[PDB]
From Swiss-Prot, chain A:
Signal peptide region: none
Quaternary context: Component of the mitochondrial ribosome large subunit (39S) which comprises a 16S rRNA and about 50 distinct proteins. Interacts with OXA1L.
Location(s), subcellular: Mitochondrion
Gene behind the chain: Mrpl48
Family: Belongs to the mitochondrion-specific ribosomal protein mL48 family.
Protein name: Large ribosomal subunit protein mL48
From Swiss-Prot, chain B:
Keyword hit for Cell inner membrane: no
Keyword Transit peptide recorded: yes
Keywords associated with the record: Acetylation, Mitochondrion, Ribonucleoprotein, Ribosomal protein, Transit peptide
Any one of the GO CC terms: mitochondrion
Superkingdom of origin organism: Eukaryota
Sites of N6-succinyllysine modification: 148
Oligomer and partners: Component of the mitochondrial ribosome large subunit (39S) which comprises a 16S rRNA and about 50 distinct proteins.
Family of this protein: Belongs to the mitochondrion-specific ribosomal protein mL46 family.
Primary localization: mitochondrion
Protein name: Large ribosomal subunit protein mL46
Swiss-Prot record, chain C:
Family per similarity comment: Belongs to the mitochondrion-specific ribosomal protein mL40 family.
Tissues/organs with expression: Ubiquitous.
Compartments it resides in: Mitochondrion
Protein name as catalogued: Large ribosomal subunit protein mL40
Subunit structure: Component of the mitochondrial ribosome large subunit (39S) which comprises a 16S rRNA and about 50 distinct proteins.
Top-level taxon: Eukaryota
Species: Mus musculus (Mouse)
Coiled-coil residue spans: none
RNA sequence: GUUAAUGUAGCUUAAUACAAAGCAAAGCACUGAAAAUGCUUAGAUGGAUAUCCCAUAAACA
């Protein structure tokens, strides 16, 4: 018996507001799908200019649900934002 | 009983839907205020322009999703099928699913099997046989040998009905987009 | 910077864009339900022929 | 075709009366997230009696 793990999506965008707007937008999209989001953590600045990364916690996926979800997420991606999918520690 | 396994491969849409011009100009406006209120060779956009007929090539479409569809030959049958391979009960569906990824396609496609539960099963009889349709999501696909001797076609659902007539093969749309 | 007329024009279509998304989500949610129900339907189909094979699948 | 499902809007036997209702869901604003809150968005009798029914989709086929 196995189920989809809890995978954090790190929304990395140079502009904080753009990431926040997508973070609010993507989370609201998750509300449509009823996807549980435990937390939205903020990473420190990517000091070298700096960039801002925002975690969108995602818990619980299904085989058919997962395939549609990623497709919706891609289309939602407004501009110059890089998506990421990584298993939580 | 003869056991035959198949995989319903899913190709992600690489390119997002284009934003409206008002969104772009609105994006410019929010971009400017964001700085004020800030708190602390690439591949071609569409690689289909040159081909126009390479259904075999994985990159038949980039804006939309695709599903691999491979002509298959059996001992007594030769019909257009979803990617299919012969499997044994000892191997689990994911293990059989993995074999389909390399056996039929022999490519370095990037696939992860997160859900072991299958999405499609249909029985075809003339000898009792059944087809297993697995489900998986692709982050990206690197399909080697685009021009194979096989008639593999990447089409999500548009060509599924055209090539797969019977309900045992035309109902694959039920779990597809 | 958008003009006040532009905001009014955008405001009208933003409602349509919200409406377009809202209709899509209802279909999308129902589509998942059919797909999930179809996935359950696929689960039942092979169970009749051979339940032992699912023993590996359910893992 | 035989069995069988299944047809007010995600849900409801809310309703056929004085309303096609209530609930779920939705945009934006409000910036930990969520929830709350303000301002806003879209809808059904696919169908009859006063059970068949055509459509749909299954085991038989």
């Amino acid at each position: 018996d196995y189920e989809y793990g809890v995978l954090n999506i790190h929304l990395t965008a140079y502009d904080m507001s753009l990431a926040e707007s997508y973070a609010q937008y993507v989370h609201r999209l998750c509300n449509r799908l009823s996807i549980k989001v435990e937390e939205s953590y903020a990473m420190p600045t990517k000091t070298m200019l700096t960039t801002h990364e925002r975690v969108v916690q995602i818990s619980g996926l299904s085989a058919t649900f997962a395939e549609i979800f990623l497709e919706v997420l891609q289309s939602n991606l407004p501009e110059g934002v890089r998506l990421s999918v990584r298993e939580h520690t | 009983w003869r056991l035959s396994g198949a995989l319903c491969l899913q190709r992600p849409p690489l390119i997002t839907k284009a934003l409206t011009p008002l969104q772009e100009e609105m994006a410019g406006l929010l971009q400017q205020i964001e700085v004020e209120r800030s708190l602390y060779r690439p591949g071609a956009r569409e690689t289909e322009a040159d081909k126009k007929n390479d259904r075999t090539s994985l990159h038949r479409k980039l804006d939309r999703n695709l599903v691999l569809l491979v002509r298959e030959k059996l001992g007594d049958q030769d019909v257009w099928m979803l990617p299919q391979v012969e499997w044994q009960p000892g191997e689990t569906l994911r293990g059989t699913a993995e074999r389909i990824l390399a056996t039929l396609s022999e490519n370095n496609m990037e696939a992860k099997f997160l859900g072991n539960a299958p999405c499609g099963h249909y029985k075809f009889k003339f000898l009792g046989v059944k087809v297993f349709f697995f489900k998986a999501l692709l982050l990206t696909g690197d399909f080697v040998q685009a021009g194979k001797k096989s008639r593999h076609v990447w089409a999500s659902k548009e060509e599924l009905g055209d090539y797969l007539q019977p309900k045992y093969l035309a109902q694959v749309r039920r779990f597809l987009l | 910077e958008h003009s006040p007329e532009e905001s009014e024009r955008r405001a009208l279509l933003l409602k349509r864009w919200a409406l377009f998304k809202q209709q899509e989500h209802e279909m999308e949610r129902d589509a998942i339900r059919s797909m999930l129900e179809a996935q359950q339907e696929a689960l039942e189909e092979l169970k009749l022929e051979s339940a032992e094979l699912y023993a590996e699948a359910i893992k």
